[PDB]
Amino acid sequence: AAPVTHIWYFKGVPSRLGYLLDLAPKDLEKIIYFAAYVITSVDEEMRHNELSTLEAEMAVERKAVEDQRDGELEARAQKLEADLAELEAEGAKADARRKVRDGGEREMRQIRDRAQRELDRLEDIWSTFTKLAPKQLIVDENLYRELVDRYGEYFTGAMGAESIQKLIENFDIDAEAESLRDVIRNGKGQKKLRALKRLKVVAAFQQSGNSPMGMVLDAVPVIPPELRPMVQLDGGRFATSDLNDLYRRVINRNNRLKRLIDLGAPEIIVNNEKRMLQESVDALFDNGRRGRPVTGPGNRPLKSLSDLLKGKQGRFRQNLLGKRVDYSGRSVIVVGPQLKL
């Protein structure tokens, strides 16, 4: 129902997506698992042809906040002066009088600091919108909700693997490849080594005609049933490979996501379900690679598709480089000295 990243190309060190898009792996972790929004596209001409009007409206909003702050502060200051005059009219202990004065000054400081926090949030919003660009992360939910409430139609932002798919769509690989070649050729240092590392994968995707979009999936293949056997045990019991339970979890989560989509569910619940779908596909492919592994009965991790190949028990060591054979036997040896060599 929603695209999913192949955990091999996200969590497999080094993050192949983290090199392709030049994103940090922790930022990729935030984007794919619905912790942070990312800016997929920014409308340059529309932001430039309306910057004057938006800045004007912004300045008026800030002036309004400042005028309200000054009104509140003046009201409180007159109130405090009147109260201290009332106390000075009667017998007023100097220390309790200064307690009242300090309470008033604290209230004023709180008014001013509240107004200043609001003005700082406004400044942050404006400076962020003026410096919007693709591949940028908005980690604050409030900041993104503001940046879409205002200026909403000037850009696009998204979470999850759908946004990574979009970033790969709007990605010009030849441009970044030639940029990295120029950086490597006309420079040196640690940035040179990082650029060589990135150029490895970028040129691998470029020279071959393999689309990088393959790193995100919209459908998952299902291995034939004979390779994930289900056998009837003694009685009503049954036995299955772990692959079947992983496929069952992926299926159930995709179905629940479809239900939530059709039901017009809150964005929070649907994002939870998309995150769970991504995590279950990651378990099906390489369990335990990110976070804790998925466990069956008895806290035992489930053998993933990748486990089938790895280790001495994997297909390579256990079924291809060596096999059990026919026309063969075994027995205890005894010494026969009467034998010939």
Binding site: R253, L263, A283
Partner: peptide, 19 residues
């Protein structure tokens, strides 16, 4: 007693309560 199952249960509860 299984995080992968509690998440499926919590989401299934939310679907049943929102509908």
């Amino acid at each position: 007693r299984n995080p992968a199952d509690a998440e499926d249960l919590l989401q299934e509860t939310m679907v049943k309560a929102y509908a």
